[model samples]
Target: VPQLTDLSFVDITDSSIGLRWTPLNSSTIIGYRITVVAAGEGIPIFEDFVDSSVGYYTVTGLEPGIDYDISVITLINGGESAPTTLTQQTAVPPPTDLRFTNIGPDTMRVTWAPPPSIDLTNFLVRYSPVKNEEDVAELSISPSDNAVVLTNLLPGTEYVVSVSSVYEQHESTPLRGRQKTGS
Candidate 1:
């Protein structure tokens, strides 16, 4: 089995992280074992076995805004190498499943599903007239507040809406939705 000496990452997202490692000897190696744990915590959250020829692995279903420690151990003929460890954090996930309901002449209710990220502090809602270029209004709400009523809007107007999740210092990509107010 090859001795993995180095580990690195290529891509990272809110729910998944990709990694690569360096192998000392490759000819006799069979596969690799990967261990992932929350940083500063002892117990592992994920473990996987992958083929040695596949030098990369993407671990998924991770929480956002939490740091994770990853280790890779090479395996061959039931033998293993010392683990190579690295640390990485996932980005906050954006709001999703944006929708609107109960549209009225001068009001509408906007709703969205929050991302699967930890440390989610709040959400922001922005809306504007699609063609009139009216002044945009922003409504900030708590994480539990999934729906908000946008009042004082123009009747029969086409509007653009965006919902985003926020962490301490990180903001996720906004999910956009459109609707026309009732006349």
Candidate 2:
């Protein structure tokens, strides 16, 4: 017999998605694969690995259909167990874009909405200050909140920032937004 665990998803958009799940036991689930077939379409637009220990996946280039089939596999004893599957129908796409604006000397605000093409329940903002190629402050915004105000920034300092939308299997392309604090 095989043990099936719950699934967890991160960014989910009309065209992209990311997720991670808890596998059975470390000794049981060694590896896993994913396959997503569009709802009632009999063809999969995305398929790949969801990572070993993390059990995460990202499916891109998806459309808003409100229905899709996802299958997960667990590798045990050097063999794959029966597949565990689930259904997902992504929400419509949000507005034209998710954007960050009104960047002040020490503060910044970000905004966005669910795309009109999908039925996404929420939006998120993942960001960090890149210094020497390292992320100093990482965060995930509340699901229901679409905007984030970053304050108490160090003045006279330059910062590089990125924001990704949370949809289905795809993480939005980085917002490519960068800023510098007022000196």
Candidate 3:
């Protein structure tokens, strides 16, 4: 219960997020309650846990680009230990080696390979005109496919697309490319 050590987001899977950490004292540990708070969202929330006698938790049911805040508390004699808190900016997946294709008026398709060295669940396409925009308005997730088709995009709008490779363990740095929305 002494502030679980080395708390971290392990990786992203198509269905769940893997979270792992160490606990300082497990001798008195009965179980743990894992909590998470998503970005631009509310209330320090609970995820889930594993009392595997080795200290591990696989936070399931996660989505992309959602900032998640997490922490853990221990139970002893059904009494709760003081909560130890940790915050992680869950990765938006990896963006890399991206190329555009199949362009047409008001429509375009873009594709990229997942970073070469990981167990990739999918890809993360974060996009916007400005590099600093976190709104993710037109960003796309490669639904179990290596390619993503952007349809009905606004004509005459300038768009910059960044592709990231995503694995269950990590997200790669972003690869950036841009296209005019077309007329």
Candidate 4:
């Protein structure tokens, strides 16, 4: 059997990837075994068998925002070809439109637009008083919610706020803002 060649991905999403390869064009080949392993953890997350006549496979059931090392091998009569491998990561969209409204002397409202991804589950909100480096406040909210009210803040205090889009296993870059509490 010939070694699998020209391995490529046609599409990549938050939880799946579509792959294609060059067929050997020989009847002596039996089938193809495709393996998808986590890149850093060295664990096989998915595997599949495809007929020799097929040139493509769509691997599913993957975690969002994770990297994978994919390998394809051709099977022959009582033997297996060397594995052809490539590395790829699932997509993760970032949050946008970060803004804040000073609703009161001790409270402020934060609002943002979620990433345009169907896989998004929630947003992780992080806020800290800028004067104190170690103090932080955090909250988790559903993707459908666009705003949150921060209460009990010190009067006339400067604060830094940030929000990140979150999936089951992925987190996007944070959108940050700086604002002061109303006096």
Candidate 5:
């Protein structure tokens, strides 16, 4: 039986993962089978087969911060090869519904909803004037807190605010919104 080699994952996001592998040149090989199961779970969340011409696939609709055990097997004329497996974790998800309240001439309060993952250690808040990048400001809030007051902003100017969930040293993509302070 023809076996797959160099199986790996790439471009992992909060909801998707890219898979790639070295293909076999044997004429007996017909296609490949892929299976994905979350760690500590018995049932697979995804399973499918692809033509032998394909060596790469992208799995979608996954959850963030999840450990997934992925398996790839080569389907030959009479049987399948031993499964090639890899374990990978998806990226953390960003905070949701970012909004600004208590707007003032030089201050505003930014708030957001937490992500689905509970492994967060903190939230990173970043704000910068829409017209200027030199005055960018960053704030770190506890995971238990979802709101922060931003002070010393330029009044009457639009600002871009981003909130991200932080897990260990990894930070999720920022959830962003724009608002202007009062004049």
Candidate 6:
């Protein structure tokens, strides 16, 4: 049995992960088997096989902001080698349906729908004037809340707002929108 080496995660997203490894150059090696399970769980959620010539694979249908235990085992003619394992976390999905309401002269209310079926540490709201990017500001809201009121803005100025989901140390892609304060 041969030992697999240099097994690593190449790419990760909200619902998929890409894996890469150094391929073995042994004629006795048949292929590889991949097993993926939620971290700390015994049951595998995904499993598959790849030919010996392949060294990279992308696994899909994963949940957002999850840690998974992924293993790759070398398949021999009659059996399998010891498994090479790596742990990786998928990115959290961003908040959706951003809306700006109660647009007053110096204050505006921002609201968004959270990503489905996942708990996050918090949500970050960033806003900047379209004409002056140097005036960027940010606010952190609780995970249990989905709305915030932004104040102290220039009336009739257009501002770009971005909302993102935060899980542990991971931040999702920002959901963005633009709106102007009432004069």
Give TM per candidate. 0.60, 0.47, 0.46, 0.54, 0.72, 0.68
Q: Count the backbone clashes (under 3 Å) in each candidate.
A: 0, 28, 8, 0, 0, 0
Question: Which has the better TM-score: candidate 1, or candidate 6?
Answer: 6
Range of the 10 consecutive residues with the lowest summed lDDT in candidate 1: 111-120
lDDT value, candidate 2, whole model:
0.63
Q: Rate the local accuracy (lDDT) of all candidates.
A: 0.83, 0.63, 0.64, 0.85, 0.88, 0.91
Q: Which candidate wins on TM-score?
A: 5
lDDT of 2 at 150: 79
Provide the lDDT at 48 for model 2. 74
Residue 7 CA displacement from its true place in model 2, Å: 1.4
Per-residue lDDT of 52-85 in model 6, one digit per residue for the tens? 9889999899888778899999998889899999
Candidate 5 has a TM-score of: 0.72
Candidate 5 segments whose C-alpha is farther than 4 A from its true place: 1-11, 14-16, 20-29, 37-46, 52-66, 79-85, 116-119
Candidate 3 wrong stretches, greater than 4 Å? 12-16, 24-27, 44-46, 94-183
Q: Residue 118's C-alpha lDDT in candidate 2?
A: 43
Q: Is candidate 3 or candidate 5 better by lDDT?
A: 5
TM-score of 1: 0.60
lDDT of 5 by residue, 1-183 (tens): 856768889988888999998877978889999999887765579799999889899989988878888889999887998888888889988888887899999999998999754768999998899898787888889999999998888789999998989999989988999999999
User: Which ranking of candidates, highest TM-score first?
Assistant: 5, 6, 1, 4, 2, 3
Better of 4 and 5 by TM-score: 5
Pairs of residues clashing in candidate 1: none
- Of the candidates numbered 3 and 5, which has the greater TM-score value? 5
lDDT of 1 by residue, 66-138 (tens): 8999889888786887888888988778878988999999999998877653457888888999996677888
Better of 3 and 6 by TM-score: 6
- Report the poorest 10 consecutive residues by lDDT, candidate 2: 114-123
